[PDB]
Amino acid sequence: KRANKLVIVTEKVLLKKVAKIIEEAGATGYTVVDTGGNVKFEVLTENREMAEKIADQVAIKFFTDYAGIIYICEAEVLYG
Amino acid sequence: SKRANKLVIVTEKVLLKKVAKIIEEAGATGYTVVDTGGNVKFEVLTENREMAEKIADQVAIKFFTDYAGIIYICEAEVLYG
Amino acid sequence: MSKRANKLVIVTEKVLLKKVAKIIEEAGATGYTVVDTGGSNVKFEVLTENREMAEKIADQVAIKFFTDYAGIIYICEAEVLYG
């Protein structure tokens, strides 16, 4: 099944706040890693709409005050 | 340049050695492994689709009825390797 | 609104972190991610302006280090939403 792999790279301080947004958006799960260049979230979303809803919330709420980038990659889910 | 399958396996850290063995025994030339929250995340650029699916089937069938996990594929264009 | 970009990923030996970071920056990359990985190794991810930049960075890293150090370089298509 084709899915959207939404990736959010932002400042580590927003880890708890962004994780809440992902969960409240109805994301079934997500990965989070520490990165240099910060924290990187990866979320396979049900549909495009959910990927965009999470992206819009994060951006609108934190991207005037915080550094970050958001992107989508196409993923084909085999299991899970 | 060559189109390849980037197989990604996210599962519990306890299965690191077991999953690594499956990748290697499938004939994977190499793989990346990282610790993750939300766990261990494997990334493997496979020769062909068939090998990507073989590894995915093996891991899922063997561990997923007992452990948490997700397996997916992303298209990658290999420039060097 | 949205823009397609090249997500260049470089996985190599941790010893080359500083050297590869310098190549990315000198190529004109606006930013990049770097993580520690097993398989120590280091993984860079760079969303490049265009394909040409992705390939310039890849050619420099590969030609200058891959005969002596281990590594792979690939590109994945990314759709940038914010940033």
Do the beta carbons of residue A39 and residue C53 sit within 8 Å?
no
Measuring CA to CA, how many Å separate C2 from each of A64, A70, B48, C5? 18, 10, 31, 10
Asked whether A62 and A56 are in contact (CB, 8 A), the reply is no
Cβ contact, residue pair A73, B74, below 8 Å: yes
Q: In angstroms, rounded to a whole number, what is the distance separating the alpha carbons of residues B1 and C59?
A: 12
Q: How far apart are CA A44 and CA A75, in angstroms?
A: 8
Reported resolution, Å: 2.3
Q: Tell me the C-alpha to C-alpha distance, in Å, between residue C36 and each of A69, B70, C17, C53.
A: 20, 21, 10, 24
Chain A touched by C74 (CB under 8 Å)? no
**Sign of the C-alpha dihedral, residues C27, A74, A26, C82?**
positive
Q: From CA C52, how far away is CA C39, in angstroms rounded?
A: 29
Tell me how far apart the alpha carbons of residues B69 and B15 are, in angstroms, rounded to a whole number: 10
Report yes or no: B74 and B6 within 8 Å, Cβ to Cβ.
Answer: yes
C contacts of B31 (beta carbons < 8 Å): 39
Residue C76: closest CA among C5, C3, C1: C5
Q: Is B33 left (phi over 0), alpha (psi -120 to 50) or beta?
A: beta
What is the dotted CATH code of the domain comprising A1-80?
Answer: 3.30.70.120
Which 3 state secondary structure label does DSSP give B25? Answer: helix
Please name which of B9, B24, A60, A71 lies closest in space to residue C31, comparing C-alpha atoms.
A71
CATH topology of domain B1-81: Alpha-Beta Plaits (3.30.70)
HEC sequence for B30-48:
CCEEEECECCEEEEEEECC
Domain range list for chain C = 2-83
Helical axes B16-26 vs B49-63, angle rounded to 10° = 150
Report the top-level CATH class of C2-83. alpha beta
Q: How close does chain A come to C6, measured CA to CA in Å?
A: 11
